[PDB]
Amino acid sequence: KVFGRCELAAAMKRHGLDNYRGYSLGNWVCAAKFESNFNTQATNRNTDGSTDYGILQINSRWWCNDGRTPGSRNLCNIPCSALLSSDITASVNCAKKIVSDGNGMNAWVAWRNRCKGTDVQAWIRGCR
Numbered sequence: 124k125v126f127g128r129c130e131l132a133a134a135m136k137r138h139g140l141d142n143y144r145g146y147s148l149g150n151w152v153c154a155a156k157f158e159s160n161f162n163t164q165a166t167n168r169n170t171d172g173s174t175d176y177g178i179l180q181i182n183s184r185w186w187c188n189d190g191r192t193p194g195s196r197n198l199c200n201i202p203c204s205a206l207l208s209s210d211i212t213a214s215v216n217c218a219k220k221i222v223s224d225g226n227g228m229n230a231w232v233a234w235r236n237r238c239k240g241t242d243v244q245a246w247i248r249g250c251r
């Protein structure tokens with residue numbers, strides 16, 4: 124599924140992401156746009172053999188099981204395929220554990236380089 128901007132904001136707001144660990148809703152929508160272009164089905168292979176999955180590009184090294192990342196952890200206890208669903212519940216619960224782990228939203232390279240320090244409220248501007 125490819126989300127609309129307002130559609131994604133209303134779903135992330137419903138699953139409790141708004142001000143989660145002090146990160147306003149605009150930070151999350153911004154990250155999604157530049158990680159996945161709002162597409163739940165996005166996948167990108169890393170050079171160390173691990174893969175990034177779904178709308179927030181969560182990494183198989185630490186967070187989910189894809190059966191082809193040797194000696195990796197599964198700290199969200201989900202198959203990677205669960206992160207590609209039209210329902211973003213799995214992606215959101217998984218992201219809550221990542222942003223809680225010490226480095227905050229710096230875990231998302233595109234958030235660090237394209238959202239941090241910018242007018243992030245612009246991303247939910249006009250949404251009900």
Ligand SMILES: C[C@@H](O)CN1CCN(CC(=O)O)CCN(CC(=O)O)CCN(CC(=O)O)CC1
Pocket residue numbers: none
């Ligand atoms: C809402 C409308 O803007 C739709 N829109 C009309 C055309 N726009 C005109 C403009 O945005 O001022 C220019 C192109 N636009 C550039 C950009 O948005 O940064 C990329 C395509 N957009 C992507 C999007 O808007 O999400 C969809 C088409």
Ligand SMILES: C[C@@H](O)CN1CCN(CC(=O)O)CCN(CC(=O)O)CCN(CC(=O)O)CC1
Pocket residue numbers: 128156245246
């Ligand atoms: C050409 C215009 O589209 C100018 N536009 C600024 C104003 N936009 C317009 C809008 O989308 O309504 C609103 C804010 N916007 C939200 C979003 O696009 O998702 C983020 C910034 N964008 C990023 C991008 O377009 O890739 C910069 C270019």
Ligand SMILES: [Cl-]
Pocket residue numbers: 147148149150243244245247
């Ligand atoms: Cl915001």
Ligand SMILES: [Cl-]
Pocket residue numbers: 188189190191192193194195
């Ligand atoms: Cl594996």
Ligand SMILES: [Cl-]
Pocket residue numbers: 144226227228
């Ligand atoms: Cl933080």
Ligand SMILES: [Gd]
Pocket residue numbers: none
């Ligand atoms: Gd824009």
Ligand code: NA
Pocket residue numbers: 183184185186187188189192195196197
């Ligand atoms: Na794994």
